[PDB]
Design a protein around this ligand. Structure first.
Ligand SMILES: Nc1ncnc2c1ncn2[C@@H]1O[C@H](COP(=O)(O)OP(=O)(O)O)[C@@H](O)[C@H]1O
Ligand SMILES: Nc1ncnc2c1ncn2[C@@H]1O[C@H](COP(=O)(O)OP(=O)(O)O)[C@@H](O)[C@H]1O
Ligand SMILES: Nc1ncnc2c1ncn2[C@@H]1O[C@H](COP(=O)(O)OP(=O)(O)O)[C@@H](O)[C@H]1O
Ligand SMILES: Nc1ncnc2c1ncn2[C@@H]1O[C@H](COP(=O)(O)OP(=O)(O)O)[C@@H](O)[C@H]1O
Lengths: 48, 435, 427, 411, 418
């Protein structure tokens, strides 16, 4: 969550003011606030 | 965590010049700005077989710079630390150990797609046919998204039988490797009994069959070992457990052949990328003349990575020869294929700052008077001893109840623990009493 | 029960106070205040355990209590903290390299403790009904506070029948894995003896709640972890010491996974101590590897005993103090043990003869201290047991001076043996 | 982008720069000067290509670092592929799974190739449809020019059912064995005939033949499981059977090359074994290099030239190399810079040549890349004399580091 | 095909009276040595002696090894000739004592008359008659054959998975059915001959193959199948109860008149490389009654024996072994003998050389060594063929002598110490 809010890319996408960008970023933040395994699930490891 | 927890980089400016005190290092400006050239050469991914020799007396920060090079390179490249004594293996050839170390010192990042079948199994019917062995197996995998009947192999059916699965439980299947795990019986059956010797796991979500991509990283030595001591499956190759089971004593015919061929095939098709790393060989002075001589071809090979040896001796007899001596305990044949880097001996001022950094890294609140007394302690003794004295002083301060280290604490610690030279003098005084 | 009293069985720990102030003759140890205080400081740093790879070198004369201080530290450190004692000559193996044996010795004194909250069910079975048509049944579990009934499933009945648990039996059921463990037979477990029964060992029924949540702990050393992960033969820790784990991902993966476990709070660390007795046996290769093996973050603390002085290093012709190269000697903190005085030798002999349960007279103590000051304290100590046997043979009560003198005339020390070696004696 | 093989100490060597009459050019194919040794190596390369003579050994000696290994790599690159060139360091024979003599004879046998030729009908086309009747079945193969049906046997239909039965797979059918290999989802489809008769040529070495015919699952040549091959039946019978393949139209032997680098590591035992291994008709040609002068042979206190015994030195020819001059050193440095992506000025080349003639040649070759990376730091384009001096100051060499030892270290 | 170092040696050039010709059979000079070699080769043909060793002693470059190869060639191929370098004894898989014993028992040959027979052809029908026998139909280009095979061979047939149409070999002596493949008419061509192949195998075998065959069991159907893997390492065959039984059975067969013993010849090179323990075990073992005749070769004079480092002996061989060993001395060659050897090597390798070139080549040989003058042959012809000239003139050898230094000029240059 910290790194997603930190990167200037998302900051500018928010400053844009467009409805989709703002609502999408808010949805992503809400999802990260929900046990982010949905936002970044733990991948199962297996030998190559 | 001590003895390497304070160094986290070379502390070089944007122009590659050594900064006075930064990144946990002080002094050694020449050595650090030179190792900057080495880290740049390693990050260039353009050369092969280059070798450096960090030469200096004990405790002059050669190993510190060796680890700072790795910290600067990051965790993306393989940094292989090795001691010269590791070549004396009892299962594989002495040169085999060194060549496999060189091979694992090279990296390879590869992006691979793999498929997976998962879902609450509804039924498992083995389709029989006369050969009179089982022909196929139809498994009905249910998921919260959908459901699919899939035909799998008799090997997968046998793996399920080993797992001791039953209809209605949850299993994780993979077609690339062929391994199948039993995640437990579906949560919907947990109400069947009051207690059972069964692990319960809810209905798997998503599609029954799903392909996912993973960007893994493995060294060339990993592929070498995977092809030399294969495990695979679908066979009874498990006899590996008793066939020979030493270190496989690899062979050049396949080390330089099939493996290089297949990895180049993977690279030139956009699937893999070569990631050359670093091979730091600390304590190179106890390597045999045979290892020193093989190092000639190792460094003159077009695939060897950047190597970094550490020299601590001035001039002694070479190991394995017993009659000849050379500088750094390395023969002039190999010493001509390296770029030597001095490690200056530290002065009182630099040693004081090093002690301060070590104390502030070990979570120690040492007073200025104690710090300055450690200056004299270090000018009379070794830097390593003066810095080792830190933690016992902190324990003694905690015992006495003071929140800081004073003169008396370090004095007590120094009086309790002697140094190398003091112990040598005591032994010389008690010569004919220590046996 | 029967584990005899060895040479170091008299010390139960360092005789130190809360402020690490060594007492004269407390907790088995006698004299040697400076070295005991150093041992206590290093032991406190150990019990703290936030610094890894620290080396100490206990040097001193032969028979001045170096191994004694080591065993005292071991005892004061007690269990729940790895302490591995190894002689310098034990690493010279034929199937594994010296460096590999040293890595094993280090990783064997690093403990990983996984703490789990698996819930179970503890009670005294009252009835186990089961009907085969898949068979289905019920169980009645009783504790001193309550009784309850459970419907048994297929695998539950299977495991119960395999373990052959019956009524009156006190058992524990791991609900997560279904593992059954019968702890004993309750007074009800009486089988109404009318047949071939030969067991009547009863025990009180379990108290408290029926379905309680207790805490388990699994403590295994990094050595065991890498050994069981090396190859499918996950029994080399007991099967045999056949080893040689490659330094490839196996050990690096153990380290990386233990790091993630420590970070996520699964099992963090418990450092340990490695007592290398007679370290002068190690080779130049061993010392050169240790030089950098002490620099690893997973390196436990080590204490090396030393009798040698200015002597050649094994495997070469380099004269160095302690028989160790200055390269490694620089990392160490050296503690020197001093020789015991008259009153220290006498007190050591007294404690030893009181530990081995032998009453000596006041003149016996004097003559034994004389013998132990003229000759080795070890010889003086060994004289006690020999002198007690002549007393028991003549049906005495406490060892006198005549028995000690008879034993001295009967057995010879090294000096008198050498002075008696006046003939060729097949040199 | 970056392949396994990268720029190395001998990557510039593309082969021997000789003419049609074995006359070396001043600087050609990455080899500079060393005319005598290069034309002496061309002769052995030519009689190696000939192969009528067996058991020849040519030793090269001189000052350390005088292209001794460069000449061998050039010989290898000129011989090219299809002709085994086994290069091994003098230590590679010291092994725990095999004796030194066994490793040396293993290398000798690896340095001998056997040529064999055969014909095989191979198929390559896109699968269209498959049918199986539980067993026999049918298949439909396609190429960009034609299609066809096949009635497949049990094993073939099973091997095809193992894969995705529906169309898409472009497989190959070796009619001899029938091993299937799907190239991908139809990678494009093949052109021309579906089934074609292809010629297969193999250069299999005697060591590979031994490993194959020595044991069930004999192909242990991928992990060196060939511990002490039984000369009693394996090697003698293999020699006889190779001699029988010969002079019958089945196979022909291709003698390889064995480059033993730093042979002074070998012991009196290895030399005594070579004394007779170089006398067998199946003995390959070999070259050897040495940097030591008259030194002790490993094993005893005998002081012999090149560390090689006299009874073996009499069994080989010797070629001396002359020290490089300013011209040769500068040209070698220029060739190294051309092989690399670095470019230096004329004054920079002069200073680097002086620095590589004061101490040694390899030092300048190594400082090349360091000076390039240091000039790339100050945001320049060409390596300048100031950058070369910065590098000469940063990185030390053998002779300037052995003299800085005015402070005593461990010993 | 390809020339070797001793390929020009056809045999000992001795006349009917035993005297050695000045130049014959590829060998020149060394008359006394060649006559002694013939005297000792007569012992090999007599075959009534055992435990005899003959040591060819001489400086390097002498024809000791050439004389050994000549002995081997004159003996031929019926009697075995086992060469072994003294360095080869230092094995790591098996002890030196047992390596030496294996070589000693492998030198000994054994000729036997094997009267085998194998039926070959395409199957036309298989009918097993809980089986008393199996009737099989075989086809070749000489007619069809109906065969009755023991039910134990029906198991081998089923395991080989043979059926109507496949070509098979079935050995009457052992039942080793081998499925060559399927007939070409449906692959291998149809055999064209008498389906009943009957012929005598007079192939020879060594006495060590018998021990190798009994060292490990060959079979399966049990856990024994696991034995086929596991490196198949060669290990010591116990002298107590294996080679003794081998000798007993071989003697039984020789008495019955099936086997025939042909004692071979051993050839040890660079004997000075053997340890003193190998030397003493050798002088102990060669006293046995079953030991073959051995030819030692020495390349150095008085030196120190390996393993002692305090005892010197002539030829690096201890006196204990040097006694009971006949010593044949090989001396240096003269200029004329060197010229003759060079001419023989040239005309054997296929190079024609002028007289003035051969003269200076013999001069170079007398100056540096015969082996060096010999090695200088090929490159001269190569330069000649490159320049167009098919023969070797004096301008080629004297120019290749400047390209290829010798072991003396090389040392003279190395004298610089760098
Ligand atoms: N430049 C430096 N800054 C801070 N500490 C240093 C520096 N150089 C050395 N040290 C300290 O000295 C100790 C030993 O140095 P080390 O790197 O082991 O020298 P060497 O590699 O020559 O043995 C390290 O624990 C480190 O804390
Ligand atoms: N301070 C002490 N208190 C009690 N016993 C001691 C003390 N010091 C030494 N000893 C006894 O002396 C005996 C031998 O001495 P030891 O501790 O082995 O010294 P070292 O290791 O130098 O030989 C031991 O059995 C030990 O019990
Ligand atoms: N004649 C030459 N032409 C081109 N490059 C050369 C020549 N001679 C030497 N070199 C280069 O200079 C370096 C000399 O080292 P090298 O001759 O390989 O040392 P050694 O052979 O003693 O191991 C090599 O990297 C080689 O590539
Ligand atoms: N009597 C001879 N006649 C012809 N050629 C000979 C004779 N003796 C030796 N030679 C040649 O001289 C060379 C000497 O080789 P070899 O016999 O191995 O010498 P050594 O006596 O040192 O073993 C051989 O190539 C051989 O062909």
């Amino acid at each position: 969550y910290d790194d997603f809010m930190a990167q200037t890319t998302t900051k500018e996408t928010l400053a844009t003011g467009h409805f989709m960008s703002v609502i999408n970023i808010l949805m992503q933040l809400r999802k990260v606030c929900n046990h982010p395994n949905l936002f970044d699930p733990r991948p199962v490891t297996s030998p190559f | 965590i001590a003895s390497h927890s304070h160094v986290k980089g070379l502390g070089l400016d944007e122009s590659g010049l050594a900064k006075q005190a930064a990144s946990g290092l002080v002094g050694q400006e020449n050595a650090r700005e030179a190792c900057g050239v080495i880290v740049e050469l390693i990050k260039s991914k353009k050369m092969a077989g280059r070798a450096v020799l960090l030469a200096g007396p004990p405790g002059t920060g050669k190993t510190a710079l060796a680890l700072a090079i790795a910290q600067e390179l990051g965790s993306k490249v393989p940094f292989c630390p090795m001691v010269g004594s590791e070549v004396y293996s009892t299962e594989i050839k002495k040169t085999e150990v060194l060549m496999e170390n060189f091979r694992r010192a090279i990296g390879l990042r590869i992006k691979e797609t793999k498929e997976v079948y998962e879902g609450e199994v509804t039924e498992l019917t083995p389709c029989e046919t006369e050969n009179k062995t089982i022909s196929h197996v139809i498994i009905g995998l249910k998921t919260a998204k959908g459901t699919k009947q899939l035909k799998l192999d008799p090997s997968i059916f046998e793996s399920l039988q080993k797992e001791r699965v039953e209809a209605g439980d949850v299993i994780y299947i993979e077609a690339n490797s062929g391994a199948v795990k039993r995640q437990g019986r579906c949560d919907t059956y947990a109400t069947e009994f009051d207690l059972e010797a069964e692990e319960y796991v809810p209905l798997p979500k998503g599609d029954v069959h799903k392909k996912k991509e993973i960007i893994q990283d493995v060294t060339l030595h990993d592929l070498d070992v995977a092809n030399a001591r294969p495990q695979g499956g679908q066979d009874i190759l498990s006899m590996m457990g008793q066939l020979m089971k030493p270190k496989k004593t690899e062979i050049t015919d396949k080390l330089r052949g099939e493996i290089n061929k297949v990895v180049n095939k993977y690279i030139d098709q956009g699937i893999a990328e070569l990631v050359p790393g670093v091979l730091f060989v600390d304590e190179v002075h106890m390597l045999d003349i045979e290892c020193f001589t093989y190092l000639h071809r190792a460094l003159e090979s077009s695939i060897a990575p950047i190597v970094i040896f550490a020299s601590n001796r001035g001039n002694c007899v070479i190991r394995g020869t017993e009659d000849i001596t050379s500088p750094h305990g390395i023969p002039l044949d190999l010493l001509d294929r390296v770029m030597i880097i001095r490690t200056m001996l530290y002065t009182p001022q630099e040693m004081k700052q090093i002690i301060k950094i070590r104390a502030q890294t070990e979570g120690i609140n040492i007073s200025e008077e104690a710090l300055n007394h450690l200056g004299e302690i270090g000018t009379k003794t070794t830097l390593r001893y003066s810095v080792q004295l830190l933690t016992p002083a902190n324990l003694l301060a905690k015992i006495n109840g003071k929140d800081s280290i004073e003169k008396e604490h370090v004095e007590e610690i120094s009086e309790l623990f002697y140094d190398a030279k003091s112990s040598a003098k005591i032994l010389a005084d008690q010569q004919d009493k220590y046996m | 029960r029967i584990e005899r009293i060895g040479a170091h069985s008299h010390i139960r720990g360092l005789g130190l106070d809360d402020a690490l102030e060594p007492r004269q003759a407390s907790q088995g140890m006698v004299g040697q205040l400076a070295a005991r205080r150093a041992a206590g400081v290093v032991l406190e740093m150990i019990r703290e355990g936030k610094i890894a790879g620290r080396a100490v070198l206990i040097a001193g004369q032969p028979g001045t209590g170096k191994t004694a201080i080591a065993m005292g530290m071991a005892q004061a450190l007690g269990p729940d903290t790895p302490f591995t004692a190894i002689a310098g000559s034990e690493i010279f193996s034929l199937e594994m390299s010296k460096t590999e044996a040293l890595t094993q010795a280090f990783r064997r004194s690093i403990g990983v403790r996984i703490k789990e909250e698996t819930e179970i069910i503890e009670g005294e079975v009252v009835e186990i009904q089961i009907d085969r048509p898949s068979k289905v049944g019920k169980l009645t579990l009783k504790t001193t506070e309550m009784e309850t009934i459970y419907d048994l499933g297929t695998k539950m009945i299977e495991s119960l029948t395999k373990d052959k648990v019956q009524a009156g039996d006190v058992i524990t059921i791991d609900k997560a894995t279904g593992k059954i463990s019968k702890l004993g037979r309750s007074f009800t477990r009486a089988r109404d003896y009318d047949a071939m029964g030969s067991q009547t060992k009863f025990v009180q029924c379990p108290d408290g709640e029926l379905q309680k949540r207790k805490e388990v702990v699994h403590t295994v050393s990094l050595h065991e972890i890498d050994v069981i992960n090396s190859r499918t033969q996950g029994f080399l820790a007991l099967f045999s010491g056949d080893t040689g784990e490659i330094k490839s991902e196996v050990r690096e993966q153990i380290n990386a996974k233990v790091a993630e476990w420590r970070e996520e709070g699964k099992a963090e660390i418990i450092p340990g101590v490695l007592f290398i007795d007679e370290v002068h046996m190690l080779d130049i290769e061993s010392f050169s590897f240790l030089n950098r093996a002490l620099e690893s973050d997973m390196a436990p603390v080590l204490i090396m005993a030393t009798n040698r002085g200015i002597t050649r290093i094994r495997g070469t012709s380099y004269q160095s103090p302690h028989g160790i190269p200055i390269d490694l000697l620089d990392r160490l903190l050296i503690v020197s043990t001093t020789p015991y005085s008259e009153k220290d030798t006498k007190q050591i002999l007294r404690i030893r003869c009181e530990e081995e349960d032998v009453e000596m007279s006041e003149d016996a103590y004097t003559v034994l201290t004389r013998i132990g000051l003229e000759t080795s304290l070890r010889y003086a100590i060994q004289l006690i047991t020999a002198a007690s046997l002549v007393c028991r043979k003549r049906k005495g009560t406490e060892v006198q001076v005549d028995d000690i003198k008879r034993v001295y005339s009967l057995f010879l020390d090294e000096s008198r043996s050498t002075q008696y070696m006046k003939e060729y004696q097949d040199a």
